[PDB]
Write a protein that binds this ligand. Structure first.
Ligand SMILES: NC(=O)[C@H]1CCCN(C(=O)Cc2cccc3c2OCO3)C1
Ligand SMILES: [Zn+2]
Length: 139
């Protein structure tokens, strides 16, 4: 579990979105596993606007933060689930690191701010849904 709170927005994994998220829906994309909902309270997370390939992510299955090198956001493969069939997820970045299903929602950050959230993993890899291209989250 986990979310990003920036301004009047909440960014979560689409497969983990609640009834409230869908009742206050701003934008969602199954291909990116992202959903953005509106909030009453103001969020203070800073979104990074950069091309960093290094950062630190929170791993809830270990109660620890880990430093990682990660790939550039690209179209990558994802096995089915009670959420989605086999497909390419777009805007996805991979790193070598520990991850378990409940780790989805953990934030990845660089020196410039929030980069993305955990969205996939397995076999010693962890995948993050990039949010740095969503310029509208700030205005
Ligand atoms: N975005 C998707 O289509 C995902 C939806 C939930 C299932 N999924 C996973 O990757 C599950 C998983 C297994 C093992 C380590 C994991 C992990 O998730 C975080 O790290 C795919
Ligand atoms: Zn950065």
């Amino acid at each position: 579990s986990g979310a990003i709170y920036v301004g009047n927005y909440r960014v979560v994994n689409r497969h983990l979105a609640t009834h409230n998220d869908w009742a206050n829906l701003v934008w969602e994309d199954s291909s990116r596993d992202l959903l953005v909902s509106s909030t009453t309270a103001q969020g203070c997370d800073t979104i990074a606007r950069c091309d960093c390939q290094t950062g630190v992510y929170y791993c809830s299955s270990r109660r620890k933060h880990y430093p990682v090198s990660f790939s550039k956001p690209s179209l990558i493969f994802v096995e089915a689930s009670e959420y989605y069939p086999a497909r390419y997820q777009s805007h996805l970045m991979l790193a070598v690191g520990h991850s378990e299903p409940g780790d989805c929602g953990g934030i990845l950050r660089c020196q410039h701010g929030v980069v993305g959230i955990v969205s996939t993993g397995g076999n010693g890899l962890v995948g993050f849904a990039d949010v740095r291209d969503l310029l509208w989250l700030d205005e």
